[PDB]
Design goal:
4 chains; A mainly alpha; B mainly alpha; C alpha+beta; D alpha+beta; B: mainly alpha; 2 helices; D: alpha+beta; five-stranded antiparallel sheet; 19% helix; binds magnesium ion; RNA-binding; ribosome; termination; eRF1
RNA sequence: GGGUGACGGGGAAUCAGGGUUCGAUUCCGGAGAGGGAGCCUGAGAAACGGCUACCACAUCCAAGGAAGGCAGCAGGCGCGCAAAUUACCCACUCCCGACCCGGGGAGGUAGUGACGAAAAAUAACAAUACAGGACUCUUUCGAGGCCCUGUAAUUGGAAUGAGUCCACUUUAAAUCCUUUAACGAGGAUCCAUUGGAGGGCAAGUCUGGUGCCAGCAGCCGCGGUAAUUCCAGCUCCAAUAGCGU
């Protein structure tokens, strides 16, 4: 008897046929186009898509004008529009199942940095993010995979308390200013 | 029948060799970058009856 | 000079003899103000000294220009030395405690269980 | 054909019940039999002491001696003829030294060219034989 | 009647739809305090941090006698393939008492911890030398560069956390994160790892050694002097703080 949770899940599912070739080809291409650190980070997106797909399927099995369907399906569509994946007007559930990986990768801080100019390559973008150089809204979102809400897109920029954003310069230039001051001069 | 003598005959009598040196290899994302770059942009040439990522004529 | 403060979820707990609220602290580019500086800042804001103010539980956020924690103000010290945790008082030196060290008191009391009556022996013990 | 009807459940479920025994894998796992025959008393590995290095001779199409280790297990007193894998590794093993022994990868059924060796040695005196083969840890003295 | 590698359940693992296996284990219910039995008090026990016997273990004895029960928490021995520190505190959560005040190894806090789970670094950008190809230009050769990709030179400064560390915060008192000054990167450094590279199955008919040996190999097989399969070196493949059995 304690406090504590013990409530945790896995966020991804590995592929069965582990050397398919065609699968490996597609996953690596995804890694290239969006600078992912690892195969499984792809598989995490795939899996969050899959859950959605299961949820959608389940709703389509319910008869239309079944309360359970109406409410839950709408909430799912509302949730999906919130992130910038579905368009308003396209909201009616069948359109979820025609919806792919790339749409969900397209809304990461790492993209919506590199997408909003700001970066200079996607790997740079990922480095920026880690190095506390870019702030969403008013917090320094350290994390690349931060799914950027459509609501929250236009508030992406550099972090105030940083070299790029317009603050104190980093420790390399500080050193090279000390070297020019005392050593050379 | 048959002895238990030779046991590590071949592990014994191989010609010993240094393990060379080259470089600090790119790890993590950087590695994955590198490999995606060298299958999907750099080469992509005119074909001549299939490829080989460790071929040797 | 440049910290700033706000006062969230304010409430007048009449029957604990206190005002109690959620302190907000903006402070961009400085290293989480010590609680003494919050007290004097709250003292001049609420016009009622530091001596009846008790503040704790300050958590900074990420990025690091916003902390947030809980604070309450007492009517007098006489009230605050009654309706407060003992630790929170000696947090600023006014109701300090013994240095017996739990294990020593229990050991002492397991001897004593060994003996009857003798107030002197039960005073001694260990 | 099948019993098929609607108040059959019993006949159906009981017939299945009686047949399940004709399955091979299931009878293994439900008659105690095999857990009795396991030297590794339903166990993943077993510590046991080496009491003779024995050359095993491989099965015909391959000709080769297979350098095994006669292990008496500790939990039982049930003797074993485990395999010392990888080249010249039998030399690391010296008599009376406390090997850990695992399965050979087939959960029974002997493997390979070897006849009847169900087990492979993993750790000789708490060390791990991979580390000795690689050259990482060493046999203490 | 016998067995159970049988405490019941909530539930857990897989899973299309059906299913199969698991459930000692934080909630609920049961049962037990070495084994059996008997009881005192009490509203409530057939109590075990209550007694009385016996059996099994075992402890002082001045040898008449006397005392004992961790399947509480730590820890030890043993068993074993198989499992943590004799730490700090009543601050939280609740309990008990005559009690606003005392007690609680309930409980909370630290330590160990690759059981398992979530996040997520090990580099990024530039001009160079170049090495290439959609465009424009050119019969071809060559060139203009919005586009770019590899290898170098670390060439270039810029960026940064690991870490070291004042201080604040945290907190019962601490830490840990979080906040934050000051130091902190040329890779010869702050060095990624496990397993593979005949097929199944992603990836060398490369070089050296050994010659049915030594060894690999879940299976098919490879090894008897040009070994794609062994021991090595090279390069390559997979996953990657993980990966083998
Ligand atoms: Mg049983
Ligand atoms: Mg219970
Ligand atoms: Mg016991
Ligand atoms: Mg009982
Ligand atoms: Mg009893
Ligand atoms: Mg006890
Ligand atoms: Mg363990
Ligand atoms: Mg406990
Ligand atoms: Mg893990
Ligand atoms: Mg490193
Ligand atoms: Mg293969």
């Amino acid at each position: 008897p304690v406090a504590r949770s013990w409530v945790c899940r896995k966020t991804y599912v590995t592929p069965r046929r582990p050397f398919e070739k065609s699968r490996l080809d597609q996953e690596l291409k995804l890694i290239g186009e969006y600078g992912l650190r690892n195969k499984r980070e792809v598989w995490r997106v795939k899996f969050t898509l899959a859950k959605i797909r299961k949820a959608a399927r389940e709703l389509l099995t319910l008869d239309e004008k079944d309360p359970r369907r109406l409410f839950e399906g709408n909430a799912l569509l509302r949730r999906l529009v919130r992130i910038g994946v579905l368009d308003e007007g396209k909201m009616k559930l069948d359109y979820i199942l025609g919806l792919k990986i790339e749409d969900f990768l397209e809304r990461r801080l790492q993209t919506q940095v590199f997408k909003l100019g700001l970066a200079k390559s996607i790997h740079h973008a990922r480095v920026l993010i880690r190095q506390r150089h870019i702030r969403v809204r008013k917090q320094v979102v350290n994390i690349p995979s931060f799914i950027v809400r459509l609501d929250s897109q236009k508030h992406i920029d550099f972090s105030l308390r940083s070299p790029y954003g317009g603050g104190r310069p980093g420790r390399v230039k500080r050193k090279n200013a000390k070297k020019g001051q005392g050593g050379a001069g | 029948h048959g002895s238990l003598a030779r046991v590590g005959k071949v592990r014994g009598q191989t010609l010993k060799v240094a393990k060379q040196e080259k470089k600090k290899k790119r790890t993590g994302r950087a590695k994955r970058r590198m490999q995606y770059n060298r299958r999907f942009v750099n080469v992509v040439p005119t074909f001549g009856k299939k490829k080989g990522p460790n071929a040797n004529s | 000079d440049t910290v700033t403060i706000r006062t969230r979820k304010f409430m007048t707990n009449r029957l604990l003899q206190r005002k109690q609220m959620v302190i907000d602290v903006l402070h961009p580019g400085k290293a989480t103000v010590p609680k003494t500086e919050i007290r004097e800042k709250l003292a001049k804001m609420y016009k009622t000294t530091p001596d009846v103010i008790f503040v704790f539980g300050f958590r900074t956020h990420f990025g690091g220009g916003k902390t947030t924690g809980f604070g309450m103000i007492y009517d007098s010290l006489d009230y605050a030395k009654k309706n407060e945790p003992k630790h929170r008082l000696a947090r600023h030196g006014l109701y300090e405690k013994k240095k017996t060290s739990r294990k020593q008191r229990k050991e002492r009391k397991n001897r004593m269980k060994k003996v009857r009556g003798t107030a002197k022996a039960n005073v001694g013990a260990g | 054909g099948k019993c098929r009807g609607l108040r059959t459940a019993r006949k159906l479920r009981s017939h299945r019940r009686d047949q399940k025994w004709h399955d091979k894998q299931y009878k293994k796992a439900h008659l105690g039999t095999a857990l009795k025959a396991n030297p590794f008393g339903g166990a993943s590995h077993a510590k046991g002491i080496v009491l003779e290095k024995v050359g095993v001779e491989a099965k015909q199409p391959n000709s080769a001696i297979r350098k095994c280790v006669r292990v008496q297990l500790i939990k039982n007193g049930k003797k074993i003829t485990a395999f010392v894998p990888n080249d010249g590794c039998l030399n690391f093993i010296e008599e009376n030294d406390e090997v850990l022994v695992a399965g050979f990868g087939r959960k029974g059924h002997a493997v390979g060219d070897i006849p009847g060796v169900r087990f492979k040695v993993v750790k000789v005196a708490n060390v791990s034989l991979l580390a000795l083969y690689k050259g990482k840890k060493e046999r203490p003295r």
